[PDB]
Design a protein around this ligand. Structure first.
Ligand SMILES: OC[C@H]1O[C@@H](O[C@@H]2[C@@H](O)[C@H](O[C@@H]3[C@@H](O)[C@@H](O[C@@H]4[C@@H](O)[C@H](O[C@@H]5[C@@H](O)[C@H](O)O[C@H](CO)[C@H]5O)O[C@H](CO)[C@H]4O)O[C@H](CO)[C@H]3O)O[C@H](CO)[C@H]2O)[C@H](O)[C@@H](O)[C@@H]1O
Ligand SMILES: *[C@H]1O[C@H](CO)[C@@H](O)[C@H](O[C@@H]2O[C@H](CO)[C@@H](O)[C@H](O[C@@H]3O[C@H](CO)[C@@H](O)[C@H](O[C@@H]4O[C@H](CO)[C@@H](O)[C@H](O)[C@H]4O)[C@H]3O)[C@H]2O)[C@H]1O
Length: 438
């Protein structure tokens, strides 16, 4: 039963309870513990059922979760959250499968991860939204990663649209770098593809600050009229402790409630970074920290005055060293096309420092244009959406064919290289593409 959490929908630049029609404001906290490299607390009832009572005391209605394991069940925890009126904002990526901001790709491997999370989590009415990326671009040196994130938003949205699932919105979470902030926010609502909502990591308010002096007034004037819901994906600067959380009074106050859809405190668990409101002891029990009462009191005080439901933008121009995100986006990764490489290529490589070494080597012998992806120029190779191993295998196979010894000896020395016997057996279009490529 999900009665206490009606699905939230988006109308204009606001969230609304789909049953009541009242504006929904996020009063949230980040909930993530640091087998899989990440820990999925929502897959383990002994963890989530310990914490929900404290989350209830805090007064939160939303958790932000950075990584789930899609191979595990989540209904116990999601139902337990619903019973307390709590929703989940969830990233689609995980640290080891996270668009690489320094070497960006939007490919079948990352897309498969995204689909897996969508198929694991979309049945829950209290799944508020998905993040298709989190601070990928983070300064003026890696703005070219943003077209890859936009492609991911488009493709996650399309995958959801074509699925039988409720049309859970797909958004983006960004940092607060002064040089890139404005351009990023415009980019994610520009042209033909838009984020559904937008979260900003917001640490401008530290200790006993004010609306005017923190920078909140400037950010609020900045986002006034923004076409999609906007909120703080993180808040809780820890410069002064115990954190007063007096920013909460401002965020849900009259001047900010008309622009922002609330925010999520960072974070629940105390870990090496010192941002918790609770600490898990040696006995796996919850010890409440000095911050907890302050957040609780502020959330309890917060009463945002909302409206009721009944009541294309130009992309930033390109400038070298300032903004290098092309409006033109990578294509939707094509699992079938890429899977036909596994079938027809003579020389294959099992997944692995070696990528950079081997691409350097192979791309000195054959033309790697077909696997390159350039977010600055909007030039994306025909097989740039395949997995890194598929891309490497393509180049190795091209070299094998160029040598033409046809002796089943693949021209790269590595235990991970093998000749593909399936290649000898008598995907038609991909074959034509690859046969053409030789
Ligand atoms: O670095 C790891 C971390 O980085 C994040 O991205 C950051 C981003 O948060 C950052 O945003 C800038 C804010 O820090 C902002 O904050 C200023 C605030 O710190 C300052 O505090 C006062 C303090 O200086 C004083 O001594 O004592 C008083 C006590 O009351 C404090 O209030 O107050 C300023 C105004 O008075 C306030 O602006 O400043 C700028 C301008 O808005 C923000 O851009 O920018 C970083 C560098 O560009 C950026 O890397 C990520 O989100 C996170 O994931 C990473 O882990
Ligand atoms: C906001 O600021 C606080 C404190 O200043 C900071 O600790 C937060 O950092 C997040 O904390 C979480 C743990 O509490 C982490 O899970 C989280 O990490 C990020 O999670 C996303 C979601 O799964 C992944 O996509 C990240 O993975 C990296 O992604 C980048 C961009 O795609 C890639 O370049 C990297 O290859 C990849 O590792 C991941 O680190 C963490 O961000 C702040 O959000």
């Amino acid at each position: 039963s999900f009665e206490k959490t009606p699905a939230i929908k988006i109308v204009g630049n606001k969230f609304f309870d789909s049953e009541s029609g009242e504006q929904f404001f996020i009063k949230g906290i980040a909930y993530q513990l640091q087998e899989t490299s990440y820990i999925d607390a929502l897959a383990d009832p002994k963890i989530c059922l310990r914490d929900i009572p404290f989350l209830k005391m805090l007064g939160v209605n939303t958790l932000r979760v950075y990584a789930i394991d899609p191979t595990k069940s989540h209904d116990i925890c999601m139902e337990a959250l619903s019973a307390e009126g709590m929703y989940v904002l969830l990233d689609l990526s995980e640290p080891d499968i996270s668009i690489n901001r320094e070497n960006p790709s939007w490919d079948v491997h990352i897309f498969e991860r995204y689909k897996s999370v969508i198929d694991a989590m979309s049945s829950f009415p209290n799944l508020l939204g998905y993040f298709a990326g989190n601070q990928v671009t983070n300064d003026h040196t890696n703005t070219f990663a943003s077209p890859f994130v936009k492609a991911a938003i488009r493709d996650a949205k399309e995958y959801i649209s074509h699925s039988n699932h409720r049309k859970i919105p797909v958004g983006y979470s960004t940092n607060d770098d002064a040089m890139t902030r404005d351009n990023l926010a415009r980019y994610f609502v520009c042209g033909d593809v838009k984020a559904d909502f937008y979260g900003i990591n917001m640490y401008e308010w530290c200790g006993y600050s004010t609306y005017g002096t923190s920078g909140y007034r400037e950010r609020t004037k900045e986002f006034e009229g923004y076409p999609i819901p906007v909120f703080f994906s993180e808040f809780g600067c820890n410069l002064v402790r115990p954190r007063p959380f007096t920013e909460v009074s401002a965020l849900y106050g009259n001047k900010m409630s008309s622009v922002w859809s609330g925010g999520l405190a960072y974070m629940y668990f105390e870990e090496e970074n010192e941002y918790g409101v609770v600490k898990i002891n040696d006995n796996d029990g919850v010890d409440i920290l000095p911050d907890f009462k302050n957040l609780k009191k502020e959330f309890a005080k917060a009463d945002p005055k909302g409206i009721t439901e009944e009541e294309s933008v130009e992309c930033p121009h390109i400038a070298v060293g300032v903004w290098e995100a092309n409006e033109k986006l990578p294509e939707t990764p094509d699992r079938s096309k890429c899977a036909c490489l596994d079938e027809i290529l003579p020389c294959e490589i099992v997944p692995f420092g070696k990528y950079e070494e081997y691409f350097s080597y192979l791309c000195s012998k054959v033309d790697c244009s077909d696997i390159l992806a350039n977010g600055k120029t909007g030039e994306y190779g025909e097989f740039s959406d395949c997995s890194v191993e598929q891309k490497l295998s393509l180049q190795l196979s091209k070299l094998y064919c160029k040598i033409g010894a046809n002796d089943r000896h693949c021209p790269l020395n590595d235990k991970n290289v093998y000749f593909n016997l399936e290649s000898l057996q008598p995907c038609k279009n991909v074959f034509d593409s690859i046969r053409d490529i030789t």
